[PDB]
Design a protein around this ligand. Structure first.
Ligand SMILES: CC(C)C[C@@H](CC(=O)NO)C(=O)N[C@@H](C(=O)N[C@H](C)C(=O)NCCN)C(C)(C)C
Ligand SMILES: [Zn+2]
Length: 251
């Protein structure tokens, strides 16, 4: 592992919802939450041996935190990931999650092109227990900006993005739960797909430690905070090539 290229630097964005509800309207509370969350997730990544040997030490580090203290004003018919209203149904607490991810990607394209990954942290209750979403590890996108021409958008956006909400079913999720979400979304970014039931090694029963982080259903069990051998094989396949493409030295 090239120590000169072993860290995926992140642009972390806290929207107005996150700032208000998780940050208590304070920059310090907002940033401290995210700084600590990413550091705990980094411990999971950095300690993972992707090949089950010595290919470890790859992780994540925040390059910049953008803090949106208030909603983005929009002209009628114009949308922005940080606008006050949910989209497409303003009556719902939250956006449709796929549309929000697409929108965030569009709005931050310029910034995303300069970083390994961009991650949006929000506080809105996506329908039916959904916590987050990311590009990559889907049956394109993920670490290192990859252009996608948006015919509707008329410009390139980049697929090096994902998002986490820390609200679910009307309440703030536990910090231990939030760690798992961001770990899972970044997991997709790093190239992992959901662990399948058909592979017991990658989706153990409860007595064998439970499921791994990439299981598609949402952390008290031993395996919950770890990547399965399935996730490790997928991530390992492109990590070194992606590392040479956009990873940097750990700070
Ligand atoms: C384990 C990870 C975080 C899966 C994500 C979705 C995902 O694949 N993100 O890339 C999720 O929200 N999963 C579930 C989840 O556990 N949701 C909440 C917890 C829920 O609905 N719980 C009980 C529902 N009867 C699903 C939403 C799809 C229901
Ligand atoms: Zn997933």
């Amino acid at each position: 592992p090239d120590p000169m290229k072993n860290t995926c630097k992140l642009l972390v964005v806290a929207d107005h919802r996150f700032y208000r509800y998780m940050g208590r309207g304070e920059e310090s509370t907002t940033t401290n939450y995210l700084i600590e969350l990413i550091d705990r997730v980094d411990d999971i990544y950095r300690n993972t041996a992707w090949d089950n040997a010595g290919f470890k030490g790859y992780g994540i580090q925040i390059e910049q935190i953008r803090i949106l203290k208030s909603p983005q004003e929009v002209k009628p018919g114009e949308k922005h990931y940080n606008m006050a209203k949910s989209y497409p149904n303003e009556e719902k607490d939250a956006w449709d999650v796929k549309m929000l991810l697409e929108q965030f990607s569009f709005d931050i394209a310029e910034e995303a092109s300069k970083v390994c990954l961009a991650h949006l942290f929000t506080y809105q209750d996506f329908d039916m227990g959904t916590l987050g979403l990311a590009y990559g590890g889907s049956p394109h996108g993920g670490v290192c900006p990859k252009a996608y021409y948006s015919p509707v958008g008329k410009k390139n956006i980049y697929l090096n993005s994902g998002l986490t909400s820390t609200k679910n079913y009307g309440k703030t999720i536990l910090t231990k739960e939030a760690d798992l979400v961001t770990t899972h979304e970044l997991g997709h970014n790093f190239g992992a797909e959901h662990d399948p039931d058909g592979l017991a090694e990658c989706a153990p029963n409860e007595d064998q430690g439970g499921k791994y982080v990439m299981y598609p259903i949402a952390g008290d069990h031993e395996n919950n905070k770890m990547f399965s051998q399935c996730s490790k094989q997928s991530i390992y396949k492109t990590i070194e090539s992606k590392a040479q493409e956009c990873f940097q030295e750990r700070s």
